[PDB]
Amino acid sequence: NKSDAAAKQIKKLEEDFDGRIGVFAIDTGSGNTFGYRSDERFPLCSSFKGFLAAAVLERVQQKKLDINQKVKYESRDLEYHSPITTKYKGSGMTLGDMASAALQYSDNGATNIIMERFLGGPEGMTKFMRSIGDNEFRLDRWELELNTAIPGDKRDTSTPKAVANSLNKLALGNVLNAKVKAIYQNWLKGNTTGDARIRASVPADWVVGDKTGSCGAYGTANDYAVIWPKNRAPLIVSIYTTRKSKDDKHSDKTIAEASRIAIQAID
Numbered sequence: 001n002k003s004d005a006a007a008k009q010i011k012k013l014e015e016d017f018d019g020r021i022g023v024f025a026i027d028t029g030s031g032n033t034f035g036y037r038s039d040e041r042f043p044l045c046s047s048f049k050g051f052l053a054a055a056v057l058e059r060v061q062q063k064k065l066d067i068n069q070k071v072k073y074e075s076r077d078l079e080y081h082s083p084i085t086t087k088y089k090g091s092g093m094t095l096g097d098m099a100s101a102a103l104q105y106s107d108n109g110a111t112n113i114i115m116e117r118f119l120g121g122p123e124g125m126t127k128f129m130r131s132i133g134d135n136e137f138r139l140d141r142w143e144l145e146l147n148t149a150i151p152g153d154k155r156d157t158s159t160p161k162a163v164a165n166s167l168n169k170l171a172l173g174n175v176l177n178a179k180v181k182a183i184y185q186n187w188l189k190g191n192t193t194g195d196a197r198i199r200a201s202v203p204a205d206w207v208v209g210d211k212t213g214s215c216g217a218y219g220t221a222n223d224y225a226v227i228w229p230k231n232r233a234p235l236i237v238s239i240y241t242t243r244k245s246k247d248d249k250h251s252d253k254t255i256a257e258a259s260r261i262a263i264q265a266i267d
């Protein structure tokens with residue numbers, strides 16, 4: 001009834017945007033879901049960095065790593081879009097601080113360093129997501145190569161549904177204890193890069209945690225979020241987009257409106 005109209009609306013949106021929109025939303029109370037192109041592949045871009053942080057936290061909780069471990073990198077020519085690591089260089093950075101920088105500011109120096117030293121490369125990141133029962137996610141390349149967003153290229157992709165399921169397991173399920181889960185949620189709540197996406201679609205009084213991606217090619221951009229409405233149980237929203245040609249720009253507005261449509265569908 002509302003699920004029907006919604007599919008109608010996303011389709012129109014998609015035609016208006018001249019591209020592909022993948023949505024999966026969960027209301028964790030009613031168990032209700034909504035899905036449009038939900039098992040199609042879309043590029044991850046930066047969005048996997050949210051899953052990266054959870055992988056570090058899991059190691060932390062098994063006491064293979066200490067969250068306060070200093071990591072040195074003064075000899076390293078930092079990658080593009082490494083805001084936090086650039087302002088810490090020469091002093092070391094705690095493991096937890098690197099992870100949260102990756103997540104909340106999408107810092108590519110942080111991401112690469114974590115994958116190189118602690119997580120066993122893109123293959124390691126893929127291993128982690130399999131371990132939580134995500135069979136769709138794959139990470140094949142490093143920053144920044146992984147942002148090529150070539151249509152029909154399967155490297156560095158997942159599905160909207162898979163992302164949403166995995167986000168639910170990590171932020172809401174039993175992969176992390178009470179303590180480390182709250183840390184992970186606080187990181188997600190302090191993401192600085194999603195104000196015009198999922199965040200722009202909800203009441204200001206709802207708490208949102210989110211992770212964005214913007215490949216910068218084929219107008220590919222995304223956002224996934226845990227939303228805490230008050231007097232109601234958490235929602236999961238997963239919004240992925242790509243466009244026809246290489247030069248096409250991404251659209252924040254489209255993601256906000258797609259988010260809004262997804263949310264109404266799961267009242």
Ligand SMILES: *C(=O)N1C[C@H](NOS(=O)(=O)O)CC[C@H]1C(=O)NNC(=O)[C@@H]1CCCNC1
Nearest residue numbers: 045046047081106147193212213214215216
């Ligand atoms: C991740 O997707 N990133 C890093 C950064 N933060 O993104 S987001 O706010 O989380 O969405 C912004 C861009 C993106 C990334 O680095 N992708 N590629 C580029 O930015 C290249 C720079 C030159 C032209 N586009 C490709």
